[PDB]
Structure formats: structure tokens, C-alpha cells
Antibody, heavy 229, light 214 residues
């Protein structure tokens, strides 16, 4: 029953704006503070913003002060994050999160029901925001051609696409055993790259054919490549 | 602005063992203005502790935390599988509220050497005018592994990037790729290409290599 659902994610160019929304349900929304937290690629958690139960007290991470505004609508149970003048460094998963349902004054008196944003006990699944000037592009798929630990290995190098994601399968998709597809790396060019690999018996190379099926919907690309020893 | 520094960076433990996580604050924070979170890939972070030492709803008594001043700790008394994840401290003594950089608690298993493979640039990629050399380290444990590239025996620096999978859910191993990126012009200028791998499961470093065009 208790849930927070985010929406508004997406690709925006630098200097652009984007608005994130979080709908709360299954709890008394008006009593709680709320905040936003983000996690950039390969980075840790970063506190972005928070506002208290009646939105009177709102505060910001140093890196977003000025550009970002948090608001709430206690009538329809939404909290928002208005993000302006977006930068490449703002690329991240953004999480909406529920704050406390109390607060404490300088005198140490605790106020039940007057929530604020000290810490977060309920988290949205998060929405992805990508800030880049890169043009949508489909991947080049190159074979990685074939012993160690008893087997051979082969794969596909899926290079220079934008945006994420891609998906990889092998021999149409019946082959999952021993397949590793690596996390994408953003290259200097601002395009992504990854490899997909799979280990196979050395004797079986000649008998069976290996093809990787690469799909990149953003650019509606589909490519199948054979890897030959 | 308060900077939180967690240590150690990673712990390799097994169910039933104790994990102790530490967080140094760059300025004194009062004992009651601290929280801890647990975060596994693909899932929302989860609150464990607030108020320095108070367990969040649903959190069992095996988690405990405390501290004051410039050091705070979280202890997991006896680890279970779901406890392998990244853990973050968070201070709310002073705005802006901030998080530590995370400490990973990962599964300890028996040593497993990498199976190591090297792939030269394909003909296709070459025709298209770029050159990538890939070194694969497959299914190994522990995580620590040094990969060094040599081109005509000259050690390479600054022109490779490593990517690593999450610890495997079935066998708790890692796989890793190291990708050396060269202009086609430079690739063509040299002959021998080599990936040298050092790892606990190998009796000595292993080198995979090829000669361009052979």
C-alpha cells in the first residue's frame, strides 16, 4: 500500500529544463517531509533537496542551489523537483524519498505530525535523467574472435551508441549459460561502449556457429554478427 | 560543508560473520543526527538507522549503530545474504545534509583464478577506422586483479578502461574487461600486443598476447 512513484525522467540537452514528479500513496502525505537524492553513474548517493511538511522550509545541495526547486501539492499528494540549467554532471538516477513525520525545536521539544527531511524511510524506485549534447546513434557491432580455464571465449564489441541502453543476446537467445555483458562505459566522445562475451568449449568451435543479436531501440537498430575463429 | 569518509572501502565476509562500518565526519556532529542506509544494485536504498542508534521500522536487532563527534559506526552482528550490499552513512547535524562515499560488503568465497583471453581489433572495426583491443578476465575471486597492457613491450598508461560485472548471484565471482583504445594509425605502427594479469589464484602473472597480422 505505501508507495512513492516517480515520473518525468529522460534525455535533455545541457541548458535545458526538466520536471520530476513523485506521487505518494498509502500514508498521510501532509504529515511528512520529502526529499530528492541522486546517484550518478558509478557514483554514490548525493543529497539534492528536501522540504518539510508544509513546504515552509526547503533546502538544497551545494551543487544544485539556484538551479533546482522543490515543491509540493498536499492536496493531490505530489512532490516535484524543477530542474533548470541542466549540466552533464547532473546525469543520474533521481530518487524521490519520504522524510520524517515529526521535528524537534531548538528547545528539544518534539512536534508529532510536523515532518521534515532529516533522513528518508521510504524510497521511490528512481527515474533516470540524462544530460548530454550527443546525438542519438546506433552501435557498430564488432566480433571478438577466439584456451584458458579449459574453454574458449568470444563476444561482440558494441561500440559508439547513444543513448543507452542496448540489449545483447546470443544465437537468437537460447544461450544464457556463461554469458557476461559488461556495464557500458561512456567514452570521451560522449558515446557509450560495451562488450558482451561468452565462454564455450574449444572442440565445439568448428561444429557450431555463434551470433550475437544486438538491439538498440532508441535508434531502432538491430544487428546480428557471426564470430569466426 | 561536512564531508563524511567511510572505511574500510570494502569488506569480504561470509554469513554469520560480523561487519563493522566506520564513518569519519570532517566536523563534530552530535550523536543523534546520523543515519545509515543499505543499497543493493537495482533496488531503492533502505533506511537502517536514524537518530544515531535507533533501528528503523522492520529492521532486526542484529543491526546496531552509534558514535559521536567525528566517528560513527554501524555493526551488522551476524550477516545474512541480503546484507551483502553497499552501506552509506548520512549526517543531518548541519545543512547541506551529506552522505559518505559508501563501503561495500561483498561475499567471501574460495579463491578462483581468472580465465584470461585477449581479442585483437576485428577486420570490420579496422575497415571503419578505429582499433580496440580487449582483455577478458572471466569468473575470478577475489576482486583485486592488476591488468597491464604492453605494446611492443612498452607499458601502456592512460589508454585503457576496465569494466566489471556485479558479483555473480550463483557463484560469487567477478568478470572484468580491459579495453585498450588506439588510433588505427598507431595500431598499425606496432606488432606485439599483450595483457598481463596478476591475481591471487595464479601462481605468477599470466600474459596473453598476439602479433598483429598473425
Amino acid at each position: 500500500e505505501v508507495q512513492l512513484v516517480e515520473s518525468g525522467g529522460g534525455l535533455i540537452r545541457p541548458g535545458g529544463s526538466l520536471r520530476l514528479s513523485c506521487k505518494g500513496s498509502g500514508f498521510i502525505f501532509e504529515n511528512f517531509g520529502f526529499g530528492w537524492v541522486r546517484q550518478g553513474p558509478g557514483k554514490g548517493l548525493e543529497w539534492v533537496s528536501g522540504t518539510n511538511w508544509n513546504g515552509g522550509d526547503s533546502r538544497y545541495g551545494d551543487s544544485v542551489k539556484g538551479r533546482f526547486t522543490i515543491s509540493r501539492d498536499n492536496s493531490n499528494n505530489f512532490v516535484y523537483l524543477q530542474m533548470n540549467s541542466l549540466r552533464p554532471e547532473d546525469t543520474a538516477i533521481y530518487y524521490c524519498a519520504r522524510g520524517t513525520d515529526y521535528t524537534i525545536d531548538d528547545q528539544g521539544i518534539r512536534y508529532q505530525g510536523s515532518g521534515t527531511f532529516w533522513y528518508f524511510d521510504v524510497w521511490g524506485r528512481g527515474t533516470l535523467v540524462t544530460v548530454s549534447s550527443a546525438s542519438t546513434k546506433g552501435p557498430s557491432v564488432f566480433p571478438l574472435a577466439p584456451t584458458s580455464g579449459g574453454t574458449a571465449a568470444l563476444g561482440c564489441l558494441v561500440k559508439d551508441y547513444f543513448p543507452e541502453p542496448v540489449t545483447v543476446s546470443w544465437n537468437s537467445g537460447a544461450l544464457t549459460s556463461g554469458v557476461h555483458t559488461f556495464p557500458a562505459v561512456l567514452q570521451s566522445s560522449g558515446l557509450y561502449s560495451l562488450s558482451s562475451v561468452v565462454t564455450v568449449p574449444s572442440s565445439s568451435l568448428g561444429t557450431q556457429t555463434y551470433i550475437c543479436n544486438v538491439n538498440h531501440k532508441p535508434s531502432n537498430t538491430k544487428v546480428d554478427k557471426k564470430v569466426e575463429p | 560543508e561536512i564531508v563524511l569518509t567511510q572505511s574500510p572501502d570494502t569488506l569480504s565476509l561470509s554469513p554469520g560473520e560480523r561487519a563493522t562500518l566506520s564513518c569519519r565526519a570532517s566536523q563534530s556532529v552530535h550523536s543523534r543526527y546520523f543515519a545509515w542506509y543499505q543499497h543493493k544494485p537495482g533496488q531503492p536504498p533502505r533506511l537502517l538507522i536514524y537518530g544515531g542508534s535507533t533501528r528503523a521500522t522492520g529492521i532486526p536487532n542484529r543491526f546496531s549503530a552509534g558514535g559521536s563527534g567525528t566517528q560513527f559506526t554501524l555493526t551488522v552482528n551476524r550477516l545474512e545474504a541480503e546484507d551483502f550490499a553497499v552501506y552509506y552513512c548520512q549526517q543531518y547535524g548541519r545543512s547541506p545534509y551529506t552522505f559518505g562515499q559508501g563501503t561495500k560488503v561483498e561475499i567471501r568465497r574460495t579463491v578462483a583464478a581468472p580465465s584470461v583471453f585477449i581479442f585483437p581489433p576485428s577486420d570490420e572495426q579496422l575497415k571503419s577506422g578505429t582499433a580496440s583491443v580487449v582483455c577478458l578476465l572471466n569468473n575470478f575471486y577475489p576482486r583485486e586483479a592488476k591488468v597491464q597492457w604492453k605494446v611492443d613491450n612498452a607499458l601502456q598508461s592512460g589508454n585503457s578502461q576496465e569494466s566489471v560485472t556485479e558479483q555473480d548471484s550463483k557463484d560469487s565471482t567477478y568478470s572484468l574487461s580491459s579495453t585498450l583504445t588506439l588510433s588505427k594509425a598507431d595500431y598499425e605502427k606496432h606488432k606485439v600486443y599483450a595483457c598481463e594479469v596478476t591475481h591471487q589464484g595464479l601462481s605468477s602473472p599470466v600474459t596473453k598476447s598476439f602479433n598483429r597480422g598473425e
